[PDB]
C-alpha cells in the first residue's frame, strides 16, 4: 500500500499521519524527528598556522669578504654589509679597524605545532542533509537514519520508507568557511596566493603536510648597530594571534535559525527550516480487517477546559455505543488541534478521555475514532505565564471558525444592515416598475 505525507522540520514534534483504505480499520502513524545534520561539500583551499622565523647565528669574516647566496626558501632575504667592529666580550674580535664584513641571513617557514592547531578554509557549494527519524506504529518502534534526498531508501521492520528532497536549499554558511578548532567562521577569506600581512592568511599551505609554503609577512632586515654582535630585523606580527583575540564571536553565536555549529566533520546540526516529504510502503500484514475491529456507533463529544497553553492544555470527553472491547486509533481532521497519544483502548461503557491542544479562542476540529466521526466546539481561555521553557506543540493558527462568540456578533451586524440594504432596494424595484408605466 502507498501513502505520502509532509512533516514540519522542528525537532521533538510528534506528527501523526492517517491511513484509510477500504476493507480495513483506519490506522495512524507517528513520525518524530530526533536530529538533523547538514554537512557542506568541503574542499580545503588552504590551511593556516602561526609562523616561526629562524635567524641563525650571524657569520662574520675578519679579513676577507663574503657574498650573497640566493637560496630557495619562502621569504628568504640575506644581504651583506661593509666593515663592522664586533667587540664581543673581552677586547675586540677581528683585531682590525676595517675590512671585516658580517653576512646576515633570515627566512620563515611553518610552525612546529602546525599539525596540531590550525585554521582550515573550505568552500560550501552543496550540502547533504541527514536525519534520525523514529517510526511508531502498532507494537513497533525503530529508529533509522537516511540522507534526506528523494532517492535514498531505508527499511523498518517489514516496511520501507524514503524521504523526499528538502523544500528549500538554504545554508547557514556561505560559500566561504574558516575552521580553527571549534568555531567555523562565515567570513570571506582572502584566496590562495594573495595573502596579506597582519590580516588572516599571512602564511598559507595547500594541505596539512606538503612543500610549497606561501608567505609575505614583510620581513625586513636592517643594519647592525655599534660594537655588539646581534642580527636585528623587523617584521609585521603574527596574524593568527590577532585572529585568536580579534575574533568577535563564532558562528555558533550568530547563526540564523538557531543551529549549533560543530566542527570536526564540519557540520551544521539541528536547524529549523522548511518541511520534509515522506513516502510509505506499509504492507498488508499490518492492518486489521474490519470484522475484527470493534464497531463504534453514535459519537458525541463535549469539551471541558481548553486553555491556550503551549502544551496539551485541553481535555474532551466522548460517548458512544460500542458492541465489543478493543483498540481504536483516533485522529484529528483539522490543523487547529492535535490530539495526543493516538491509540485509545475502547471498553464496554461509552466514555473515553482525550488530550488536545489548540492555539485559538474557538476550535472546530472533528474526531474519528473507528470509521465514525463527530465535531467538537469549545470556548477557550488564554493562559497566564509569559515566558515558558519549552517550545510549541500546536500549529500557529488564530482564527475562530464560523460560529464562535467573537464571530456571532459579526453575523448579527452583517445580516442586520445587509438585510436592510436589500429592503431599500426592494422599495426602488417597486417604484421603478409601477410609476415608470403609469
Amino acid at each position: 500500500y502507498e501513502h505520502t505525507a509532509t512533516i514540519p522540520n522542528v525537532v521533538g514534534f510528534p506528527y501523526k499521519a492517517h491511513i484509510e483504505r477500504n476493507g480495513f480499520s483506519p490506522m495512524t502513524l507517528q513520525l518524530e524527528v530526533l536530529g538533523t545534520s547538514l554537512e557542506p561539500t568541503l574542499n580545503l583551499e588552504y590551511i593556516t598556522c602561526e609562523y616561526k622565523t629562524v635567524v641563525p647565528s650571524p657569520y662574520i669574516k675578519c679579513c676577507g669578504t663574503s657574498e650573497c647566496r640566493s637560496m630557495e626558501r619562502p621569504d628568504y632575504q640575506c644581504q651583506v654589509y661593509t666593515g663592522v667592529y664586533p667587540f664581543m666580550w673581552g677586547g675586540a674580535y677581528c683585531f682590525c679597524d676595517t675590512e671585516n664584513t658580517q653576512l646576515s641571513e633570515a627566512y620563515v617557514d611553518r610552525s612546529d605545532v602546525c599539525k596540531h592547531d590550525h585554521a582550515a578554509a573550505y568552500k560550501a557549494h552543496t550540502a547533504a542533509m541527514k536525519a534520525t527519524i523514529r517510526i511508531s506504529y502498532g507494537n513497533l518502534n525503530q529508529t533509522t537514519t537516511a540522507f534526506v534526498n528523494g532517492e535514498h531508501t531505508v527499511t523498518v521492520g517489514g516496511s520501507r520508507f524514503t524521504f523526499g528532497p528538502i523544500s528549500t536549499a538554504w545554508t547557514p554558511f556561505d560559500n566561504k568557511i574558516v575552521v580553527y578548532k571549534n568555531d567555523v567562521y562565515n567570513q570571506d577569506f582572502p584566496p590562495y596566493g594573495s595573502g596579506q600581512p597582519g590580516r588572516f592568511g599571512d602564511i598559507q599551505s595547500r594541505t596539512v603536510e606538503s612543500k610549497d609554503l606561501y608567505a609575505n609577512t614583510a620581513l625586513k632586515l636592517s643594519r647592525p648597530s655599534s660594537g655588539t654582535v646581534h642580527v636585528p630585523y623587523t617584521q609585521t606580527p603574527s596574524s593568527f594571534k590577532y585572529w585568536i583575540k580579534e575574533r568577535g564571536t563564532s558562528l555558533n553565536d550568530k547563526a540564523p535559525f538557531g543551529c549549533v555549529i560543530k566542527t570536526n566533520p564540519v557540520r551544521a546540526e539541528n536547524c529549523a527550516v522548511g518541511n520534509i516529504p515522506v513516502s510509505m510502503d506499509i504492507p498488508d500484514t499490518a492492518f486489521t480487517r474490519v470484522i475484527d475491529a470493534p464497531a463504534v456507533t453514535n459519537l458525541e463529544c463535549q469539551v471541558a477546559v481548553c486553555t491556550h497553553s503551549s502544551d496539551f492544555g485541553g481535555i474532551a470527553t466522548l460517548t458512544f455505543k460500542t458492541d465489543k472491547p478493543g483498540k481504536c486509533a483516533v485522529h484529528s481532521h483539522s490543523n487547529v488541534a492535535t490530539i495526543q497519544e493516538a491509540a485509545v483502548d475502547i471498553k464496554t461503557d461509552g466514555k473515553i478521555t482525550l488530550h488536545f491542544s489548540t492555539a485559538s479562542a474557538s476550535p472546530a476540529f472533528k474526531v474519528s475514532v473507528c470509521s465514525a466521526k463527530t465535531t467538537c466546539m469549545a470556548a477557550c481561555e488564554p493562559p497566564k505565564d509569559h515566558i515558558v521553557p519549552y517550545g510549541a506543540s500546536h500549529n500557529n493558527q488564530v482564527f475562530p471558525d464560523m460560529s464562535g462568540t467573537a464571530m456571532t456578533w459579526v453575523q448579527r451586524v452583517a445580516g442586520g444592515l445587509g438585510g436592510l440594504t436589500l429592503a431599500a432596494v426592494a422599495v426602488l424595484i417597486l417604484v421603478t416598475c409601477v410609476t415608470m408605466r403609469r
Binding site: 568577535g248 564571536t249 553565536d253 547563526a255 540564523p256 535559525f257 538557531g258 505565564d385 509569559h386
Partner: protein, 53 residues
C-alpha cells in the same frame, strides 16, 4: 584546564520581555540571539552589577 562558572542570573518575566539581573566578580561575556527567521546578535563584556532587558 580549569575555568570557574558564573552565578546563575536572576530573571523576571514580563509581557514579551525578560529582565535579567547580573552579578560578576570579573569580566564575563554575554551573548543572546533570536532563534527565528532573523538573528539579532548582542555581545558585551559585563564588568559590574548591571541590569538588562
Amino acid at each position: 584546564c580549569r575555568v570557574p562558572v558564573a552565578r546563575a542570573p536572576g530573571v523576571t518575566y514580563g509581557k514579551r520581555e525578560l529582565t535579567v539581573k547580573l552579578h560578576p566578580d570579573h569580566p564575563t561575556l554575554l551573548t543572546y540571539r533570536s532563534l527565528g527567521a532573523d538573528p539579532r546578535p548582542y555581545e558585551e563584556w559585563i564588568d559590574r552589577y548591571v541590569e538588562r532587558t
